[PDB]
Amino acid sequence: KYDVVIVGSGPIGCTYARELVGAGYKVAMFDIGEIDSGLKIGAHKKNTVEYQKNIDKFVNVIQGQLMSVSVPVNTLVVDTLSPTSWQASTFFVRNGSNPEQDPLRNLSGQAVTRVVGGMSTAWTCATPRFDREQRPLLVKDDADADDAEWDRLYTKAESYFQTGTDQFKESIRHNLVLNKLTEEYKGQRDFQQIPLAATRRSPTFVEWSSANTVFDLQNRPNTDAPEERFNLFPAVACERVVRNALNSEIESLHIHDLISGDRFEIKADVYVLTAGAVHNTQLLVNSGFGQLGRPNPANPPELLPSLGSYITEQSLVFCQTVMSTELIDSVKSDMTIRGTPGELTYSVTYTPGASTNKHPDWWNEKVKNHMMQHQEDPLPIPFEDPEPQVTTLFQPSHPWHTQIHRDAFSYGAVQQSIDSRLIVDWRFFGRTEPKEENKLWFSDKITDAYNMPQPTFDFRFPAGRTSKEAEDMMTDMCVMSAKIGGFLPGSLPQFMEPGLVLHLGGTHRMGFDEKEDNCCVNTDSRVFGFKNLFLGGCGNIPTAYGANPTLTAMSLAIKSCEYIKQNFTPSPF
């Protein structure tokens, strides 16, 4: 028996833990995955000296913990086997494939992570706010009050994640790109650093944020928190919440301890599901919410009929570019060069404080020293210069989020022939209208690796605005990127596989009224009809959004915890 049980140790479960552990509740958290980040539990796996000296290797960490959600039956023909080798005469269900899944209506890129800290052990740490157009209402019919509430919640969420907008301010590459885009779109669009949940520790090391930054996940009481009560139980699959007959309260959480193999019940006053947008939905459907099995309008669900409908996933377009000659030359515009590199007389100088100069003295000092100390190198950019981290945020006239940066999630073999200092990534993210017909559903016959109902998608990007904007977004990336350089062969402009982006929303969506707003939870993230069941995560977000969703989910979680603190009393200690 606990006051609060939290299912999942990602950043949203850790928001609940931070708030409720600190308010004096006796809290248990369960995660199906295991401790994986070193002694700081749930921390970012990129925070090792070795990864930040070898950042192109971190893609492997990401791939090693992303398990595909739904893989259709494979129908590739291999007809070069030896005649002696066994073969079936059909494309039978094999290798964990989902025979429920239509390959042409999938989110094939969707994947999940089962590790303590969830996906925050690997994420990019981009934490923009949503503007009004992307954001669910929290206050009706008072836009200024709605704005104020979101400001309060986002400010707190940014403190929990340690979001900032200046960690890359000393990068030549970053400023080169930022300034060029600002000049080219003079006035029409604004560019800034991507807001990043990160703290720079040195010129070559950034402590990226994670679940661990939100809550350190150490069992309590302990020496630094002697009056707090928290236990984390890894390798525990949560399987079901038990409803009372009234459908007004949850009475227990059924768990499966994966090490001992045993199944148990856990009692709490408050149950919080933060297993991610897929797995929250799976747990609820396994518990009698929504409808199990292939959708069937001749059998409508008794509870939460919009659960698993109106799902959204963003369109993602990507390319990389190779910096233009004009931009590279501009880095060294303040330099006077005499002689030829490698000779006795070679000299690269700048007149400091000359205001015929384009750059600050710090920039020019970096460049001069690189040029003098590495005369065999043909570029003016220092070797350890950090990557660009640039955005123009979503606006009505460009309704997509943008990142102009270097991401550790590379999508192809990493090329080695072109100097890495020249390369910039472009990722533009589109917003998807919620539609009832877009669904996440769970099989009544097929099970996943943990013996739970197999997830199945029925998804297409909506016709209309979603599709038109997606193609306008692609064009915008082609036009904007060209101001910085031409495309890099092997990273030409492309749409990524649906759901690779991992910004799935709306699977258990929020609204004011269950029926009118086709929703599952209220603005306190409380499941309609239930006193003591709350859902956290991106699954709550009911709108068409392009920006990265986690900060918005965390903000909703903070609001949810206010409701809990006001309506449930911590047990005596």
Judged by beta carbon, residue 423 or residue 547, the one nearer ligand FAD is 547
Query: Which member of 398, 405, 503, 508 is catalytic?
Result: 503
Query: Which member of 47, 106, 280, 548 is catalytic?
Result: 548
In this chain, which of 8, 10, 33, 386 binds a second copy, going by CB under 8 A?
Answer: 33
Annotate 111-155 with three-state secondary structure: EECCCCCHHHHCCCCECCCCCHHHCCCCCCCCHHHHHHHHHHHHH
126 near ligand FAD, judged by CB under 6 A: yes
Catalytic-residue membership of 95: no
Give the start-end residues of each E strand in 124-262.
Answer: 163-164, 192-193, 196-202, 205-208, 220-222, 225-233, 236-243, 250-257
Distances in Å between the Cα of 478 and the Cα atoms of 319, 334, 384 are 9, 31, 28
Please check whether residue 138 is in contact with residue 562, taking contact to mean a CB–CB distance below 8 angstroms: no
Host H or E run for residue 281: helix 276-285
63 near a second copy, judged by CB under 8 A: yes
119 near ligand FAD, judged by CB under 6 A: yes
In this chain, which of 100, 269, 387, 407 binds ligand G3F, going by CB under 6 A?
Answer: 407
Q: What distance in Å separates the CA atoms of residue 415 and residue 560, rounded to the nearest whole number?
A: 46
Give the number of other CB atoms < 10 A from CB of residue 159: 10
31 near ligand FAD, judged by CB under 6 A: yes
Q: What distance in Å separates the CA atoms of residue 414 and residue 434, rounded to the nearest whole number?
A: 35
550 near ligand FAD, judged by CB under 6 A: yes
Q: Taking the chain, what is the end-to-end CA distance rounded to the nearest angstrom?
A: 13
Q: What distance in Å separates the CA atoms of residue 426 and residue 483, rounded to the nearest whole number?
A: 12
Stretch that binds ligand FAD, among 87-95, 124-132, 320-328, 520-528 (CB under 6 A): 124-132
403 near ligand G3F, judged by CB under 6 A: yes
548 near ligand G3F, judged by CB under 6 A: yes
111 near a second copy, judged by CB under 8 A: yes
370 near ligand G3F, judged by CB under 6 A: no
Q: Which two tokens stand for residue 263?
A: 């199944």
SS3 566: helix
485 near ligand FAD, judged by CB under 6 A: no
Give the number of other CB atoms < 10 A from CB of residue 2: 21
Please check whether residue 18 is in contact with residue 220, taking contact to mean a CB–CB distance below 8 angstroms: no
Catalytic-residue membership of 106: no
| DSSP symbol at 521 | B
Q: For residue 524, which phi and psi values (nearest 5 degrees)?
A: -95, 10
SS3 542: coil
In this chain, which of 238, 371, 424, 544 binds ligand FAD, going by CB under 6 A?
Answer: 238
Q: Which two tokens stand for residue 394?
A: 């979503």
Judged by beta carbon, residue 461 or residue 545, the one nearer ligand FAD is 545
Judged by beta carbon, residue 196 or residue 510, the one nearer ligand G3F is 196
Judged by beta carbon, residue 143 or residue 463, the one nearer a second copy is 463
Host H or E run for residue 465: helix 465-481
Footprint of ligand G3F on 122-181 (CB under 6 A) = 124, 126
Stretch that binds a second copy, among 14-22, 316-324, 545-553, 563-571 (CB under 8 A): 316-324
Closest contact distance (angstroms) between CB of 397 and a second copy is 16
Footprint of a second copy on 494-513 (CB under 8 A) = 494-502, 504
Q: For residue 148, which phi and psi values (nearest 5 degrees)?
A: -65, -40
507 near ligand FAD, judged by CB under 6 A: no
Footprint of ligand FAD on 280-309 (CB under 6 A) = 283
Pairing of strands 335-338, 347-350: antiparallel
Footprint of ligand FAD on 509-548 (CB under 6 A) = 537-538, 548
376 near a second copy, judged by CB under 8 A: yes
Residues 6+ positions from 199 with CB-CB distance below 8 Å: 162, 164, 167, 206, 207, 209
Half-sphere exposure of 386 (CA within 13 A, CB side): 20
Edge-first strand listing for the sheet containing 192-193: 192-193, 389-391, 400-405, 423-430
User: Mask of contacts with ligand G3F, 486-525, x by CB under 6 A?
Assistant: ---------------xxx----------------------
Judged by beta carbon, residue 171 or residue 548, the one nearer ligand G3F is 548
Q: Which does 106 bind (CB under 5 to 8 A by kind): ligand G3F, ligand FAD, a second copy, none?
A: a second copy
Footprint of a second copy on 554-573 (CB under 8 A) = none
Interface with ligand G3F (CB under 6 A), residue total 10
In this chain, which of 132, 263, 468, 515 binds a second copy, going by CB under 8 A?
Answer: 468
Interaction site with ligand G3F (CB under 6 A): 124, 126, 403, 407, 409, 427, 501-503, 548
Q: Which residues are catalytic?
A: 503, 548
Interaction site with ligand FAD (CB under 6 A): 7-13, 30-33, 62, 113-115, 118-120, 122-126, 237-238, 274-276, 279, 283, 409, 502, 537-538, 548-550
